[PDB]
Design an enzyme around this catalytic site. Structure first.
Site, PDB file in Angstrom:
ATOM      1  N   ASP A 147       0.839  -1.099  -0.062  1.00  0.00           N
ATOM      2  CA  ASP A 147      -0.123   0.217  -0.048  1.00  0.00           C
ATOM      3  C   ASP A 147       0.993   1.193  -0.005  1.00  0.00           C
ATOM      4  O   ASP A 147       1.702   1.133  -0.635  1.00  0.00           O
ATOM      5  CB  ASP A 147      -0.968  -0.367   1.197  1.00  0.00           C
ATOM      6  CG  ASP A 147      -2.145   0.804   1.390  1.00  0.00           C
ATOM      7  OD1 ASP A 147      -1.913   1.833   1.991  1.00  0.00           O
ATOM      8  OD2 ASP A 147      -3.563   0.562   0.593  1.00  0.00           O
ATOM      9  N   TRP A 148       0.519   2.160   0.843  1.00  0.00           N
ATOM     10  CA  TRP A 148       1.276   3.448   0.975  1.00  0.00           C
ATOM     11  C   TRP A 148       2.591   3.065   1.390  1.00  0.00           C
ATOM     12  O   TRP A 148       3.514   3.790   1.282  1.00  0.00           O
ATOM     13  CB  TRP A 148       0.633   4.441   2.004  1.00  0.00           C
ATOM     14  CG  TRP A 148      -0.111   5.454   1.186  1.00  0.00           C
ATOM     15  CD1 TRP A 148      -1.736   5.273   0.909  1.00  0.00           C
ATOM     16  CD2 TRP A 148       0.122   6.678   0.471  1.00  0.00           C
ATOM     17  NE1 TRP A 148      -1.931   6.252   0.245  1.00  0.00           N
ATOM     18  CE2 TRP A 148      -0.966   7.136  -0.215  1.00  0.00           C
ATOM     19  CE3 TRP A 148       1.416   7.162   0.401  1.00  0.00           C
ATOM     20  CZ2 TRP A 148      -0.857   8.426  -0.958  1.00  0.00           C
ATOM     21  CZ3 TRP A 148       1.382   8.397  -0.354  1.00  0.00           C
ATOM     22  CH2 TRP A 148       0.259   8.878  -1.050  1.00  0.00           C
ATOM     23  N   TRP A 202     -13.599   1.798  -0.861  1.00  0.00           N
ATOM     24  CA  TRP A 202     -12.583   1.626   0.119  1.00  0.00           C
ATOM     25  C   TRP A 202     -12.527   3.304   0.680  1.00  0.00           C
ATOM     26  O   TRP A 202     -12.571   3.556   1.993  1.00  0.00           O
ATOM     27  CB  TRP A 202     -11.588   1.403  -0.541  1.00  0.00           C
ATOM     28  CG  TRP A 202     -10.065   1.721   0.339  1.00  0.00           C
ATOM     29  CD1 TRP A 202      -9.215   2.715   0.103  1.00  0.00           C
ATOM     30  CD2 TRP A 202      -9.113   0.824   0.894  1.00  0.00           C
ATOM     31  NE1 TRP A 202      -8.220   2.749   0.921  1.00  0.00           N
ATOM     32  CE2 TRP A 202      -8.025   1.372   1.258  1.00  0.00           C
ATOM     33  CE3 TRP A 202      -9.345  -0.487   1.725  1.00  0.00           C
ATOM     34  CZ2 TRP A 202      -7.059   1.064   2.332  1.00  0.00           C
ATOM     35  CZ3 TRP A 202      -8.311  -1.035   2.298  1.00  0.00           C
ATOM     36  CH2 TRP A 202      -7.104  -0.099   2.799  1.00  0.00           C
ATOM     37  N   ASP A 247      -7.277  -9.080  -3.671  1.00  0.00           N
ATOM     38  CA  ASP A 247      -7.340  -7.593  -3.743  1.00  0.00           C
ATOM     39  C   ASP A 247      -8.235  -6.714  -4.797  1.00  0.00           C
ATOM     40  O   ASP A 247      -7.935  -7.252  -6.055  1.00  0.00           O
ATOM     41  CB  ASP A 247      -5.903  -6.878  -3.958  1.00  0.00           C
ATOM     42  CG  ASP A 247      -5.868  -5.701  -3.259  1.00  0.00           C
ATOM     43  OD1 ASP A 247      -6.962  -5.041  -2.927  1.00  0.00           O
ATOM     44  OD2 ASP A 247      -4.640  -5.257  -2.784  1.00  0.00           O
ATOM     45  N   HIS A 285      -6.188  -7.193   0.321  1.00  0.00           N
ATOM     46  CA  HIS A 285      -5.283  -6.203   0.261  1.00  0.00           C
ATOM     47  C   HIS A 285      -4.108  -6.388   1.432  1.00  0.00           C
ATOM     48  O   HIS A 285      -3.255  -5.816   1.008  1.00  0.00           O
ATOM     49  CB  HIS A 285      -6.105  -4.693   0.446  1.00  0.00           C
ATOM     50  CG  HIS A 285      -5.431  -3.398   0.167  1.00  0.00           C
ATOM     51  ND1 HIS A 285      -4.717  -3.169  -1.122  1.00  0.00           N
ATOM     52  CD2 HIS A 285      -5.077  -2.401   0.847  1.00  0.00           C
ATOM     53  CE1 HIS A 285      -4.189  -2.162  -1.034  1.00  0.00           C
ATOM     54  NE2 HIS A 285      -4.387  -1.355   0.344  1.00  0.00           N
TER      55      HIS A 285
END
Length: 310
Positions: free
Chosen positions: A124-125, A175, A260, A289
């Site tokens: 992710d980030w 999301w 995901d 995810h």
């Protein structure tokens, strides 16, 4: 100077499967009087360092299952909580959170601790940010373990990294909607929805950092940042591409959480091609995810692929 608040210690009293001692840094250049929490696990004198970066809307608790495996392999494991998450201080204003404020914390953290032989672990980030670090000091980074992440480039240079934003309606769009719209955001509920195998204890570990909405400016800004990419994010992510592509000569291990709806196969296969030397990925059929919630497996396999090259 930067207005922020601290989650009370009592909130983490009862965490499930998180026996890691806290380490804090409150003297980072550029982040005056802002306390940063990080775990420092395994032999601190280890030659190898696993730098575990989390994403939205988690913290280092997310790597709880991976930490022990890497630690028992002889490595040092660093897992910091971004300003705004976990046990770190949380700026109260959404405006304060930008890509560079998070990217610069990381470089500062890496210099302060003088981290070398880094095995970068992102998702992710942790990945959008993480992946633009090696280029600022390539000698510090030796390997990469990448899970469902990509580069925040522009819609033109990499459409696969922009397309999920709009489709499907039950992916990034839902999301996002879940995160920036409720006025009473319950992270435990949100997590149970997006990481369905979490027990109830687990999921509350995810809400632990935020007693009320005032602690969630950071959680609220990430999503808006993916949706509205600033020019420096774009320039930076764009330069990263080139690093992955021509300068990276490290070992790489990729894992994909196949359910995901956000950063699935349709994002990971094209990332796989930009990463020089990227082997074939480990497809985790049951993972969504949060591939880290299936961490043990990803960690064992990875140390396994890395040792078959030493």
């Amino acid at each position: 100077m930067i207005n922020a608040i601290r989650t009370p210690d009592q909130r983490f009293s009862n965490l499930d499967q998180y026996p890691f001692s806290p380490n804090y840094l409150d003297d980072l250049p550029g982040y005056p009087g802002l306390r940063a929490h990080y775990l420092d696990e395994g032999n601190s004198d280890a030659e190898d360092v696993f730098l575990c970066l989390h994403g939205e809307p988690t913290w280092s608790y997310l790597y709880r299952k991976m930490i022990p495996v890497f630690a028992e392999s002889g490595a040092r494991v660093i897992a910091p909580d971004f300003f705004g998450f976990g046990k770190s201080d949380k700026p109260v204003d959404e405006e304060d959170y930008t890509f560079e404020f998070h990217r610069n914390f990381l470089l500062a953290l890496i210099e302060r601790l003088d981290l070398r032989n880094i095995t970068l672990v992102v998702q992710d980030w942790g990945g959008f940010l993480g992946l633009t670090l090696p280029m600022a000091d390539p000698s510090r980074f030796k390997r990469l373990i990448i899970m469902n992440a990509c580069l925040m480039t522009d819609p033109v240079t990499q459409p696969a990294f922009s397309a999920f934003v709009t489709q499907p309606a039950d992916g990034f769009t839902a999301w996002k909607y879940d995160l920036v719209t409720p006025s009473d955001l319950r992270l435990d509920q949100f997590m149970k929805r997006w990481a369905p195998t979490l027990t109830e204890a687990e999921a509350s570990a995810y809400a632990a950092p935020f007693p009320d909405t005032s602690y969630q400016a950071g959680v609220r800004k990430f999503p808006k940042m993916v949706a509205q990419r600033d020019q420096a994010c774009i320039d930076i992510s764009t330069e990263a591409i080139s690093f992955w592509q021509n300068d990276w000569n490290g070992q790489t291990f990729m894992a994909i959480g196949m359910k995901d709806k956000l950063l699935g196969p349709d994002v990971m296969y094209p990332m796989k091609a930009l990463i020089n030397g990227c082997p074939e990925p480990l497809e985790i059929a049951d993972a969504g995810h949060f591939v880290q919630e299936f961490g043990e497996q990803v960690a064992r396999e990875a140390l396994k692929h890395f040792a078959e090259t030493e």
